[PDB]
Amino acid sequence: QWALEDFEIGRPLGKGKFGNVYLAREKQSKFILALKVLFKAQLEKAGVEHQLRREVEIQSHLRHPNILRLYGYFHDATRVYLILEYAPLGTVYRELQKLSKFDEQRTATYITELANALSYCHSKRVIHRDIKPENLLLGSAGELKIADFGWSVHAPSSRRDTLCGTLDYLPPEMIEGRMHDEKVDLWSLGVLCYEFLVGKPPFEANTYQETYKRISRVEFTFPDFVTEGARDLISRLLKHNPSQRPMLREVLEHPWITANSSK
Template identity: 75%
Template sequence: MAIAQTNSQQQEKVSSEASAGEKKRWTLSDFDIGKPLGRGKFGHVYLAREKRSNHIVALKVLFKSQLQQSQVEHQLRREVEIQSHLRHPNILRLYGYFYDQKRVYLILEYAAKGELYKELQKCKYFSERRAATYVASLARALIYCHGKHVIHRDIKPENLLIGAQGELKIADFGWSVHTFNRRRTMCGTLDYLPPEMGMWLTIETK
């Protein structure tokens, strides 16, 4: 199924509808489903078009049975609550969610160029200018998060996406927390854990 590009005005329309919250009850019939974009432990991500606005989104489909089996329902609720309230050009938007008997659907901003990790694999290395731009964008997004008392706790190239204009966006807030206190939780991805976590030192940011 061919899916056309949309403009910023259409994006604002979907965003305003999603923020209406109680007024809008999303269902799968509100979307045209396109090609698969990826898959994870609990489900799949598809390119989709919201029919009313023609806005392109990424639709993340999670299976309830797998969420329950892994006992991460509370983690998903926390992810939705946190990410849906974040507004920053370098943070992937979560427009809304809905569910049926077997699945939970997250309506996410579409980052056209995919994962930073895959882009790095393709390019082998980034120029100093490009790398510096990504680092600066990431730093601004993290400063914003920490100002909102949100800690991501799983920053890695696989969780950084690239938008159509080459802009970096933090995604996947599954390990994130909203807290006013210091944390000692061992979490995240083993390959990217900083030394202080391995030594059980108090951390405030990740």
Template identity: 70%
Template sequence: MATAGVGAALLDKENVGALGGKALEGKGALGKRPLESGSGGADAKLPRKSALQPLSANVVAGSAGSAHSGSAAKPLSSAAGSMGPPPPRAATSGRGASEAGAVPAARERPASGGAAAARRWQLTDFDIGKPLGRGKFGNVYLAREKKSMYIVALKVLFKNQLQQSNVEHQLRREIEIQSHLRHPNILRLYGYFYDSNRVYLILEYAARGELYKELQRAGSFDERRTATYIASLAKALIYCHSKHVIHRDIKPENLLLGLNGELKIADFGWSVHAPNSRRKTLCGTLDYLPPEMVEGSYHDSAVDVWSLGVLCYEFLYGQPPFEAAGHSETYKRILRVDLRFPADPARSDGAKDLIKRLLVKKPADRLPLEQVLQHPWIQANADPAVLARAT
């Protein structure tokens, strides 16, 4: 695909489809916990790393050739505006000036239903603040929409890196799925736009950052906090599955915390919209892979139930349940469902019972998400406000 073609391809919803079984270089078949051969041999596993690392560069710096390279970045703090969605505009935004000629500031297209015209987003609509994180394909920045003063997170993806890793179709699918989801425990994708070099995603700002870093600092979470997170995730996944969306990569690195500590699913890069509910692509992260994926069998939404069990274990004990010295040994433990509960930290029988009901080899025998919310341990420990919420 030509350099200018990534943004245009985002508009082609007919191209949004399955991965077709192809492993992606960007995340790899095993996700963001990289596996490589090292001093320990072919099965050696590298230390686990956070999906986002600190940045010192600014999005505006070094942007020669961009339509907005002359825009000056302004200092910005999270307190400098209201957190929330920017005013609605056309969801599929136009090219930057360097790609399609000069774009007038008032360029508009009629909105649906005869409503007032909605101008397309561009980088000059935002004040760019501090970097929030970095990934393989680009960076995330704190940003403020100038007119409304709303605080958002601006994810900047570099087209050449997307093309080199052949993941344009994955980005299209991620945008198509996440932009249509509305749930308090799912990070909102408000819109996107692009120029000749980059694609920009306008995302909800999660003020308290990555859950994985919080887990690293704490070592593990207590039962009340864990139960609240699991109940929140169960509700979010029930919602996703009702929309025929399978997430397929639930793990701490893909979860953020909102201003009040509420959990947000933030990464839908491996998600699929699968009305037939049968997929065969190996994807996700090694420690979270369910047995059916390890075996190369067809899988359905029950993979998210398995991941919820792994997550519950990791929250309570500080490490995944099937972790081993090498990834081949991890595969074996997953296939055997070799579940062991360490004596330290001490956890209740109720917590262990829920985990054992979720980590079941046969997908059909895993505890349904609706019953997760009714489990006695969840009922006794989760925040009542979360349990009482309709969704």
């Protein structure tokens, strides 16, 4: 069992509504990790305790290269602490703001990485991971890690979309006040891919109700440059009916994936 003084604390990597993630290192081994700090006073207000409590339980059990590993958890009085894997390269979000778009090789690789994570997660009976770029981190060299977990944290940047970066990634079934099956995730995949190539999500709009309009009615159009295998994958992924959406492995199999995927 750990405690706060077992750790040296660096800068905040990102600041959230319930707390902050700090760069840290265990004092003895001098091994660097990321410490999520949860103020716990917003935690009651927001009515989230027991959930989080079993969430550390679940995510404790998740081992994947494309999933950020939760090493441990502890708490004191005012704060809960998640001891996390450190991802040196930061957010795919700032990367995407850097380049303004990715290419098909990068994109295809990220998408297979993600598909593996979600496939793994499903086999572990875990659904509805938050895969929007803000929640995705970059490991040692290029590798892509799903952060999720602690409700969303940001490093200072852009400013533009703050949130209201929200439902672009929400599926019609979720937004529409209904339940969801594992297939929720494959909608996000579609959206992600689009963004990667385009630089913006397919449903982006200057009002919430209009974004909704486009999502639930699945109204989205490709710029000239998007290749059609890309189009096929995306169109195949974004379907009002969950049942018409591919299974993950089918996604990995997709011809365009295999074509440009470095993995």
